[PDB]
């Protein structure tokens, strides 16, 4: 099973899932990782929210339940799977534990023998800032939309399998109550004023087993003699990574079993064996201890490890409060490709209608404040100069991109409308488009004043003057300029406060290569209009 | 088949394409970088040599990089640039083959005495390759018998024809095989120089074969006319579609047929989205296509006119708009009376009063030209423009049951009312929102 490969020969240094869906008072979503053996489920009320949680963490192999499976309507969607028993198992939500056994059966039956787990935890997609699909989507988070870069591969200097791990995770959840982050951001702040003691840890760290991956396998009965190898060798860069922060970082004291393999072993693992299994069970006495140091390790890999990136690209530590303020913002993603005119914004729970052409920076414009703030509320020094963000409840979007264009879009404002808040902060783009023309300038006034009385940070970024002039008490103009230079035009990467007093259209349309009578009897009937 | 092609400089552009394989030589002049890159894209080469010029160009070769070294020593006769790649292959292959090669008579071909086909034409109708999903036209099509018959096939897709004389010559042939069921049963069961033709081949074992794959898909078109129901298409100057299909999306769910009428008219096509409208212009193009390849097409009856070349604009650094806007520049920079084009929303994605501007002028500006013009957008202000060789069609939605009931149903004459605010709605839009909308949308309606 893609979702039960226990061997360290296939899998990278992220976690894998094996799914399984079960109905009953809920949506029972179980994801379970013969790797790590993180054991982990939660039951969904929303289809919506549950594909989501499942898009999340993109299992490989998802298990429905018998209720679905004949659910030939249901199946088709969801297609648009292995079979095994969904008898509840444990306790809890009915949905949960038949879902839950079903990956315990499932991987047991694809183990040959039991398997090695950890506490079944109950988490709740509500009590982190919410991150629907097409937001990760749309702020290429993870992937990207076209290209090779996302904020992940930049963010990416961990240095081990388990930290990527644990780093992966506060992305696909990012924060809430500040206590929390403020201790993360604290942290990050250490390793960056003490740049020899991140330049330790790092350079320590790199090559270090996956004590939990490890570990895991000692209780599972496969840890190898090689795995040893590389585990003596950890446990022993151990002593060395406790003498650079101190006896604060609680790292355990594995001396014992480290001085032991030592011995017990040839300096390059490839009666003997009755003498192999003797050590191994002296190891594996300390299962937990081991997955506790991966654990607290992880922790420094990526709280130096964004910290390196931080001060590497430049990066502020954030202030919250109750208003959003960035001077001199990027596009992280972006800015490691070309040269980066920064920005800067103010916002209050208000709308902010962006105009002016395109090509101007209007989209990554939006995009480069969702990351800073999913930067800020995930736990990183974000791209800028100073930034004040809110504590954001959650971060929707409407970006780019059987059914048209159109309707997907609609849909899209649909959900925005019906779960932001006067915390949420939602960017849209051109909502309300590829239709005819009043519909367009129609709908667009409803979604914005929809928005506007729901007193969400919004940044709405339109072509729409007429929704520009719509005297709101919350409304706030901002445009970005193109310039008719030399070329054609002098597109500037700003956004200048107030309306765009000039129309573009016809010019970058005249620009782009239109014939000059064309152009010509179109800026005519544009006037004449 | 496959390809090595050379690019050299010099009284035009010079395109050497050539396969070891099928030991195909043939190349080419270009004037216009873009009908290069062009012609370029239509032979898919693996591997291009680049003259020294192009080489050093620091901006040419990053260009190029973005959408092996050999001496281009001049060979044989004709324009500079063009034996130059030309001999960069010879020199290039005859080194990679550890000696002399075979070739057939180097082929000179005039891309210009064919009907046009650009990269995104090709990209929009999913001919080759397929925009999502699995189908193409070509798939579909395929039922060629013999590695010939298909190279030949797609040659003629990649080479659309335009005399009237050579295609009937075709389609003659094609009937042939489909009024003689047996005979076509026949071959079609039967068909499934360079030293280096080892024993096996033998055991297995250019002229007869060329008039067989020639063959091979004589027959293997038909047994997709057979298999998949198609009809003869009829020349001439009008263009009816009695029942036609998008051969693609037909093999994959029930398709309820359309008609359509046209003479170098510029043709609109309102209603909302979802009903068919997009489809619908391709599934016209495709027709032409199919009829100017060589093969029935999906319908009951059809008659199409020779049509030059096939632009669009279809779905789908710069943005967007720029990229569109490119895009309809050439159209009407190549487009002409006897052009096939296909628009849809052109001038969208800007500003209230620009879109509903520029979409008047690229209209009249087809209008005038007098190319048969499937302009398909949601522009009304476009459908009440009082020209000679308008005509209105419109696609319907239905507020039934559900929410609405989109009909796959091209109607003649404009659409009545407006559906935005409805699909809106339906899309799972809030209530006040909608009734906010539907009310800022009387308001601006009655003036």
């Given at each position: 099973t893609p979702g039960t490969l226990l061997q360290e020969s296939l899998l990278p240094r992220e976690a894998n899932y094996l799914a399984a869906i079960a109905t009953g008072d809920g949506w029972g979503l179980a994801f379970l990782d013969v790797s790590t053996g993180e054991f982990k489920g939660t039951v969904l009320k929303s289809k919506s929210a549950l594909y989501d949680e499942?898009?999340?963490?993109?299992?490989?192999?998802?298990?429905?339940?018998?209720?679905?499976?004949?659910?030939?309507?249901?199946?088709?969607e969801?297609?648009?799977?292995?079979?095994?028993?969904?008898?509840?198992?444990?306790?809890?939500?009915?949905?949960?534990?038949?879902?839950?056994?079903?990956?315990?059966?499932?991987?047991q039956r694809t183990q040959g023998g039991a398997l090695s787990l950890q506490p079944f935890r109950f988490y709740d997609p509500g009590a982190f800032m919410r991150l629907p699909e097409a937001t990760l989507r749309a702020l290429e988070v993870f992937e990207p939309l076209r290209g090779q870069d996302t904020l992940f591969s930049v963010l990416d200097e961990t240095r081990t399998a388990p930290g990527r791990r644990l780093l992966q995770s506060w992305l696909r959840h990012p924060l809430l109550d500040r206590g929390p982050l403020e201790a993360r951001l604290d942290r990050v702040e250490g390793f960056v004023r003490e740049?020899?003691?991140?330049?330790?840890?790092?350079?320590?760290?790199?090559?270090?087993?996956?004590?939990?991956?490890?570990?895991?396998?000692?209780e599972l009965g496969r840890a190898s003699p090689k795995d040893l190898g590389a585990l003596r060798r950890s446990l022993q860069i151990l002593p060395e990574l406790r003498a650079l922060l101190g006896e604060e970082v609680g790292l355990p004291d594995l001396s014992p079993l480290?001085?032991?393999?030592?011995?017990?072993?040839?300096?390059?693992?490839?009666?003997?064996?009755?003498?192999?299994?003797?050590?191994?069970?002296?190891?594996?006495?300390?299962?937990?201890?081991?997955?506790?140091?991966?654990?607290?390790?992880?922790?420094?890999?990526?709280?130096?490890?964004?910290?390196?990136?931080?001060?590497?690209?430049?990066?502020?530590?954030?202030?919250?409060?109750?208003?959003?303020?960035?001077?001199?913002?990027?596009?992280?993603?972006?800015?490691?490709?070309?040269?980066f005119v920064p920005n800067d914004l103010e916002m209050a729970?208000?709308?902010?209608?962006?105009?002016?052409?395109?090509?101007?920076?209007?989209?990554?414009?939006?995009?480069?404040?969702?990351?800073?703030?999913?930067?800020?509320?995930?736990?990183?020094?974000?791209?800028?100069?100073?930034?004040?963000?809110?504590?954001?409840?959650?971060?929707?979007?409407?970006?780019?991109?059987?059914?048209?264009?159109?309707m997907v879009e609609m849909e899209e404002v649909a959900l925005i409308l019906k779960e932001a808040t006067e915390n949420s902060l939602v960017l849209l783009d051109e909502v309300g488009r590829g239709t005819s023309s009043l519909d367009g300038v129609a709908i667009a006034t409803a979604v914005a004043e929809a928005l506007h009385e729901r007193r969400a940070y919004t940044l709405f970024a339109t072509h729409y003057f007429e929704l520009t002039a719509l005297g709101l008490?919350?409304?706030?103009?901002?445009?970005?300029?193109?310039?008719?230079?030399?070329?054609?035009?002098?597109?500037?990467?700003?956004?200048?406060?107030?309306?765009?007093?000039?129309?573009?259209?016809?010019?970058?349309?005249?620009?782009?290569?239109?014939?000059?009578?064309?152009?010509?009897?179109?800026?005519?009937?544009?006037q004449a209009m």
């Amino acid at each position: 099973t893609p979702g039960t490969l226990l061997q360290e020969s296939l899998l990278p240094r992220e976690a894998n899932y094996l799914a399984a869906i079960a109905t009953g008072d809920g949506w029972g979503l179980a994801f379970l990782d013969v790797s790590t053996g993180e054991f982990k489920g939660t039951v969904l009320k929303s289809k919506s929210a549950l594909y989501d949680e499942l898009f999340r963490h993109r299992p490989a192999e998802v298990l429905l339940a018998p209720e679905l499976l004949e659910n030939g309507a249901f199946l088709d969607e969801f297609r648009k799977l292995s079979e095994a028993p969904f008898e509840p198992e444990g306790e809890g939500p009915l949905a949960l534990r038949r879902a839950r056994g079903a990956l315990l059966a499932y991987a047991q039956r694809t183990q040959g023998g039991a398997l090695s787990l950890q506490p079944f935890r109950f988490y709740d997609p509500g009590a982190f800032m919410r991150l629907p699909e097409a937001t990760l989507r749309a702020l290429e988070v993870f992937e990207p939309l076209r290209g090779q870069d996302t904020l992940f591969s930049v963010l990416d200097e961990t240095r081990t399998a388990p930290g990527r791990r644990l780093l992966q995770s506060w992305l696909r959840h990012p924060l809430l109550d500040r206590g929390p982050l403020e201790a993360r951001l604290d942290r990050v702040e250490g390793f960056v004023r003490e740049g020899a003691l991140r330049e330790g840890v790092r350079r320590l760290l790199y090559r270090l087993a996956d004590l939990e991956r490890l570990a895991t396998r000692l209780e599972l009965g496969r840890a190898s003699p090689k795995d040893l190898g590389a585990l003596r060798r950890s446990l022993q860069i151990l002593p060395e990574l406790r003498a650079l922060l101190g006896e604060e970082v609680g790292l355990p004291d594995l001396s014992p079993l480290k001085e032991e393999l030592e011995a017990a072993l040839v300096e390059d693992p490839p009666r003997e064996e009755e003498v192999f299994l003797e050590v191994r069970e002296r190891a594996k006495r300390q299962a937990e201890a081991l997955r506790e140091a991966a654990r607290i390790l992880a922790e420094l890999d990526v709280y130096a490890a964004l910290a390196e990136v931080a001060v590497r690209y430049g990066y502020v530590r954030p202030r919250f409060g109750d208003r959003l303020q960035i001077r001199a913002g990027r596009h992280p993603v972006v800015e490691r490709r070309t040269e980066f005119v920064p920005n800067d914004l103010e916002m209050a729970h208000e709308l902010v209608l962006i105009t002016g052409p395109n090509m101007a920076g209007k989209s990554t414009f939006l995009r480069q404040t969702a990351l800073i703030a999913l930067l800020a509320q995930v736990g990183s020094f974000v791209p800028a100069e100073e930034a004040h963000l809110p504590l954001f409840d959650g971060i929707y979007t409407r970006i780019g991109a059987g059914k048209s264009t159109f309707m997907v879009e609609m849909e899209e404002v649909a959900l925005i409308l019906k779960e932001a808040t006067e915390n949420s902060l939602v960017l849209l783009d051109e909502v309300g488009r590829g239709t005819s023309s009043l519909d367009g300038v129609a709908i667009a006034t409803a979604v914005a004043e929809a928005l506007h009385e729901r007193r969400a940070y919004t940044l709405f970024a339109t072509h729409y003057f007429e929704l520009t002039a719509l005297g709101l008490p919350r409304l706030k103009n901002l445009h970005v300029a193109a310039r008719e230079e030399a070329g054609g035009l002098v597109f500037y990467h700003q956004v200048l406060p107030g309306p765009a007093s000039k129309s573009y259209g016809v010019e970058v349309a005249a620009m782009a290569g239109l014939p000059k009578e064309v152009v010509a009897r179109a800026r005519a009937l544009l006037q004449a209009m």
